[PDB]
Design a protein around this ligand. Structure first.
Ligand SMILES: [Br-]
Ligand SMILES: [Br-]
Ligand SMILES: [Br-]
Ligand SMILES: [Br-]
Ligand SMILES: [Br-]
Ligand SMILES: [Br-]
Ligand SMILES: [Br-]
Ligand SMILES: [Br-]
Ligand SMILES: [Br-]
Ligand SMILES: [Br-]
Length: 220
């Protein structure tokens, strides 16, 4: 995480304060620094903690500066700060676990220090079809509910219908169902012409987080 939360100029300035502006050791110093953090090069942290960690690294830089200004060897200074940061990292709050089988799960997002970028679970947007069997004249209810946490802001539910009795996730068979809004869709009453797949797209603003599918089997 050293490379992600400190810049090359900061690290060069630290090493110069250690050995000198244009010292021949100035190169070795560099490789003592980065190597000292080699173990933390592939850690994954809770995305929501990145700022915190970055701030901590800022503190670290200053702590090193003073250490260099007061003589002090870089050879011991860098492993020391590396272990301090290792403990800081171990005490950070964890992101939520990935929950199968589908969805963009923002509360599971993690920051990868190897590459310095964020990542959610590699799950499909489309969730498995849920079979819902009712009889003619009976009420049917589709709950657009996922098993992972959704953001609070800007969530909408868009419904679609693929008729003709198709059990399908293929979008080319669906038309929009503008009557339906919200997480709960009701067919009152269900009839044979409702046979088909109902889909609900959960969106944050305009980006989809999940697409659910309900195959309504209406029985005579
Ligand atoms: Br940050
Ligand atoms: Br020292
Ligand atoms: Br985590
Ligand atoms: Br939120
Ligand atoms: Br909505
Ligand atoms: Br089918
Ligand atoms: Br449409
Ligand atoms: Br409609
Ligand atoms: Br409702
Ligand atoms: Br979509």
């Amino acid at each position: 995480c050293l490379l992600c939360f400190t810049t090359y100029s900061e690290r060069l300035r630290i090493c110069q304060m250690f050995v000198g502006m244009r010292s021949p050791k100035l190169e070795e110093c560099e490789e003592a620094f980065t190597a000292a953090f080699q173990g933390l090069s592939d850690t994954e942290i809770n995305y929501d903690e990145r700022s915190h960690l970055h701030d901590t690294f800022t503190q670290m830089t200053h702590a090193l500066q003073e250490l260099a200004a007061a003589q002090g060897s870089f050879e011991v200074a860098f492993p020391d700060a590396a272990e301090k940061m290792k403990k800081v990292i171990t005490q950070l709050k964890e992101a939520q676990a990935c929950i199968p089988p589908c969805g963009l799960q923002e509360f599971a997002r993690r920051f990868l220090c190897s590459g310095c970028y964020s990542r959610v679970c590699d799950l499909p947007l489309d969730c498995p079809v849920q079979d819902v069997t009712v009889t003619r004249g009976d009420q049917a209810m589709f709950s657009c509910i996922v098993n992972f946490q959704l953001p609070k802001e800007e969530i909408t539910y868009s419904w679609k219908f693929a008729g003709g009795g198709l059990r399908t996730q293929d979008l080319s068979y669906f038309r929009d169902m503008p009557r339906a809004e919200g997480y709960l869709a009701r067919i009152r009453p269900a009839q044979l012409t409702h046979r088909g797949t109902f889909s609900c797209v959960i969106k944050q603003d305009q980006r989809p987080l999940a697409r659910l599918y309900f195959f309504l089997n209406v029985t005579g």
